[PDB]
Amino acid sequence: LFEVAWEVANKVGGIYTVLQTKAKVTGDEWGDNYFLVGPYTEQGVRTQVELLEAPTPALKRTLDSMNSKGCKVYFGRWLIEGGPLVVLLDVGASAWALERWKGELWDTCNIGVPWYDREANDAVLFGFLTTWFLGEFLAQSEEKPHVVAHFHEWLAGVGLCLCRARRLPVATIFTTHATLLGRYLCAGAVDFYNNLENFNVDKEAGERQIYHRYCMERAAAHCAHVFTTVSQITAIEAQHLLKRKPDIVTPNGLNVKKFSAMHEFQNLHAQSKARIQEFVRGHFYGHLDFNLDKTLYFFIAGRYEFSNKGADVFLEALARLNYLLRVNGSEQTVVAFFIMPARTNNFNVETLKGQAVRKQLWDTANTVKEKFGRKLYESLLVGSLPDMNKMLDKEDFTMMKRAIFATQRQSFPPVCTHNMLDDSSDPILTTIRRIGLFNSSADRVKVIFHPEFLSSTSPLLPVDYEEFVRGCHLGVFPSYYEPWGYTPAECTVMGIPSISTNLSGFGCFMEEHIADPSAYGIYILDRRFRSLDDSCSQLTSFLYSFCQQSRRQRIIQRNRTERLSDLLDWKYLGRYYMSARHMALSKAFP
Amino acid sequence: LFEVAWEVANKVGGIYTVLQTKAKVTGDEWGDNYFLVGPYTEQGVRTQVELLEAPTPALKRTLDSMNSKGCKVYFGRWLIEGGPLVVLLDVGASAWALERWKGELWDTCNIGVPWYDREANDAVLFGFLTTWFLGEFLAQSEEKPHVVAHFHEWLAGVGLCLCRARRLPVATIFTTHATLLGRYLCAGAVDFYNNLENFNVDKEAGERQIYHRYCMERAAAHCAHVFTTVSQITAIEAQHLLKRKPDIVTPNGLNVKKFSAMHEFQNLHAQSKARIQEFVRGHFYGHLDFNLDKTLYFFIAGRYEFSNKGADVFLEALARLNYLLRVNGSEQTVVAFFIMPARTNNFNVETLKGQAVRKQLWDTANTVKEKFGRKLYESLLVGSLPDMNKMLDKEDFTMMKRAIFATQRQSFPPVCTHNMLDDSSDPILTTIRRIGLFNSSADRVKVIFHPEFLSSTSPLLPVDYEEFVRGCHLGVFPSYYEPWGYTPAECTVMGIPSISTNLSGFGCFMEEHIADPSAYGIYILDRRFRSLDDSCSQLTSFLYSFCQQSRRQRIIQRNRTERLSDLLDWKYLGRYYMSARHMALSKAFP
Ligand SMILES: O=c1ccn([C@@H]2O[C@H](COP(=O)(O)OP(=O)(O)O)[C@@H](O)[C@H]2O)c(=O)[nH]1
Ligand SMILES: O=c1ccn([C@@H]2O[C@H](COP(=O)(O)OP(=O)(O)O)[C@@H](O)[C@H]2O)c(=O)[nH]1
Ligand SMILES: O=P(O)(O)OC[C@@H]1O[C@@H](O)[C@H](O)[C@H](O)[C@H]1O
Ligand SMILES: O=P(O)(O)OC[C@@H]1O[C@@H](O)[C@H](O)[C@H](O)[C@H]1O
Ligand SMILES: OC[C@H]1O[C@H](O)[C@H](O)[C@@H](O)[C@@H]1O
Ligand SMILES: OC[C@H]1O[C@H](O)[C@H](O)[C@@H](O)[C@@H]1O
């Protein structure tokens, strides 16, 4: 098996997660005949990969057959023990002969990549290197086994045509997880779901680009022995646009972390929410005028797509929910996070300063705490109950007064934790300042935009993504166009209720698998049969309905949402890959 | 309402718990017309009671009507906010005229108490004082209301005859929670449950005593307007021995502590089990040759009755389970606690020394821990990953070696944490040394006898009873004769599976309230239709079956057992007291 892809060592939301979750089961069920191919980027990928430059059995012949011939191929383990013997390929090591590879592409399939975008050039170069490695392996192994080559996305789709030109006896499977042409039309301010058969692919390809990419994608789909897509909705645009109906639907699964107790995810949520509460206390210093027990943490994560990931409708719903909470005289407050990576330069002074003063207050309270504890210990040793007024003197009251005065703040807490280099052109900040949300005292919702992926080694918010998601209360992902949707998937795996859409692969998958959804925390939101304003109103209604329920109802809802983890497990969802491999073997050679 | 009883301020297992749990609901449903009467003992009862010597409304007339007349009456709150206005009565303050009270008893009902036992003399004196207080209150209040007087046990049963002699217009309810004659015959090595109608009460009363007590109990039962008992099994011996069928059965409830989350009792169990693990590490120092993750904590609590609370059968079952675990080659180990108060003098040196060396090892590990943390912090500040061998020098290895040598122990850990003044006559230690259980390395079960009630301010085991019970895994109470049974009741309230009996009020109550018991953690054990050896074999089978199930099964079983807390709630079980009060009002005056 060869699961060649571009995201194996570099962290990107797509491809990387599905491969990392699949590797364990796909290796334990099959064995050491599982091989993974990907690129090399000088970004720290070697930190997570245990490279094996020295010769190693289980395809030891290529190391002394081709490595010392002007190429660069490594063998790694990934630090994940699913037996993922990964074949890492360097991109910049072999780039001096791009002209001959372009000529080879011209001879074979009249395709290639223009010099405008280096991403696709690197993808094609990696495809050439992968094809050379696979051919060398077949030559060295005397063609005794019939290996199956599987391809993900267009970043590794040139392998299909390269192998078909050379007629290598392998079973070809191609699985596209996102028709990028659909992605770039859905961002073109044009309706995409009302009609699909009225699109002219060649006319649209090129004004927004995606002409060579579309051509190579369709060539791979046609020439691949087995074609596959993520959701049933994915197959719909695949057969209507690429004119190649997928052989079988292959829903995306996850490696659920089973605990010895059913309620351990609740404890993880409690701890992570405590950490988020510490961050909130840091950010809203001098403005802690709202109860923190009535605070709910909403969030929308993923790549920074405004109209595709559904951030405009979420912000409109947040403004409306703020208006209803203000006019209803409610003590509930909602802190909404926005984890969408936009380029910054560093943090702003306000956020780091807020964390600093929060922990300075923590230190001052600690000091008074040890002094009080020592005096109380003396009193208990003597045998007299404290009268509570003889312990604290004038100096510690003086320093508490000084600390309180130092934390006084007149400006409002910032909406962005980082210092972005383009604030006049950022959609999120623009609409935030348009809808009049500035974390004010009167505001019932507080927006925090964290334009960066979460990491466990960050100066502020020392939580990785999974822990932070476990800490939140509701994940709102009203995405207009996205094939499957991972973020709601692990939200429901970790027990957090989520707001999906009927235009999403996750929402569609959970639509017909459960009778009466939204009773299990899956607030499916209709975006196909409703206008934008109606969808915003429905999102506001869903948010308010989540707000009105008490703590017991929230706990019960989280339990019900967690109970659905078995649907997205790779044990249940891995059978489709096995079926695809069986069809590929039957088509190529029994 | 007057709930007069002997255990209101002094801590005894019976009476005290039921009154303390009932007070909240019986005061919130009725109001400030609820009055509680009890004795005064110079044992610290005033620490838990906020006495009000100064005049206070809501029966302010007695304070300036009778208190300054040679008596001693206080008003208290109990520190429990169920509105329990308690009328505390001093016992030793008014004891100079016992002869006239004895003559009054002779004139009224030919009863009294012989000078052999001072407990019953104090009870009768308290009854006289209570009757005087009630009569003075009626005189001062102009008899406007028709108050209801309720009596518990024979320690407050002279009030019935004293009030009937004076014909005070009150509604009399008497509730006996234990027919003491049954208790003392069941300890006389004679069968009690095979027949009940063949007993001669007068012949049996006096050789074991309980003649005056039996006479006054039956006089109270006959003269009381409403008679009541704890369980249905209680009414059975009440009508067959006292010849006064109770008007209605009144099962004993509990004030369940509801948490905002369903699983919080699991977290409490985890924390309490961690504390018990610390105690076990202290006790078994130099002998930690068994995995602590495979350790299950069984316990049997309550008053020190050997054949009545079922301690002999539990120890036989423990020995048998040890034999099966040894011959089965099992890694599971079981630590069985015995909380039965027997008089001691202090702790023994071994147990305190064991706790001391445990925490000395904790301190040594802590010291090495700070040194390692500082060196690691230096390494991380520099920027170099530790090589793990340059940090620890020779001195800290030297002190770890010295600490390890100091904790070496050749004698086995003791079975009793305290130093009892009669070890040659203690039934528990006698049978423990007979069945050959000495906490050896080969022994799969380890017995710890803690001859004292648990307290939160003890030098070792700083846990109160409820926390310790939450920490255990299974409460075994194979009691032969006991009317209702509180310990399994709060074991099931707090989620711990329990082993009750069909001769118990709790076991009988749960028998016909749930279809197919032992599926909810209620291991009902038959002791009526089975011999002693067969009962021991069934207990051994139950213990082994509990041992074989894994952690997930234990968690599920605890959840199921916790789900039954609503059956024993005072909300559901308090209706019988309301019915009894209604019948008393109907019988006395509508
Ligand atoms: O702060 C973040 C936000 C998102 N993700 C990852 O990004 C993926 C989102 O994938 P999705 O299919 O939702 O959309 P994509 O971002 O791939 O377009 C999830 O798997 C997350 O694990 C992350 O690692 N850190
Ligand atoms: O270490 C202990 C052991 C027992 N109990 C109390 O003793 C009572 C046991 O009552 P039960 O009806 O089981 O028997 P009794 O001891 O009254 O005969 C329970 O309510 C416990 O709260 C306690 O407070 N501490
Ligand atoms: O954050 P909330 O919705 O109020 O949930 C409250 C918390 O949920 C879970 O983490 C646990 O059950 C906690 O014990 C509980 O306090
Ligand atoms: O002591 P056990 O029977 O092994 O139960 C194990 C513990 O039970 C509960 O206290 C919690 O669920 C803990 O998370 C779990 O570790
Ligand atoms: O469909 C699988 C997932 O990965 C894809 O590459 C897309 O980035 C994402 O939106 C999709 O949900
Ligand atoms: O019946 C109520 C409870 O209190 C009684 O006084 C007994 O001490 C106890 O065994 C009984 O279970």
From Swiss-Prot, chains A, B:
Q: Tell whether Transferase is among the UniProt keywords.
A: yes
Annotated residues for binding of alpha-D-glucose 6-phosphate: H263, E264, Q266, H269, K273, H473, R554, R558
**Any single GO CC term annotated in Swiss-Prot or TrEMBL for this entry:** cytosol
Q: In which tissues is it expressed?
A: Expressed in skeletal muscle and most other cell types where glycogen is present.
Q: Kindly list the positions annotated as binding UDP-alpha-D-glucose.
A: H177, R183, R303, E482, W484, G485
EC assignment: 2.4.1.11
Q: Where does UDP bind?
A: K11, R303, T487
Q: How does it assemble?
A: Part of the GYS1-GYG1 complex, a heterooctamer composed of a tetramer of GYS1 and 2 dimers of GYG1, where each GYS1 protomer binds to one GYG1 subunit (via GYG1 C-terminus); the GYS1 tetramer may dissociate from GYG1 dimers to continue glycogen polymerization on its own.
Name by which UniProt lists this protein: Glycogen [starch] synthase, muscle
Q: Which organism is it from?
A: Homo sapiens
GN (gene name): GYS1
Complete-protein stretch covered: 29 to 618 of 737
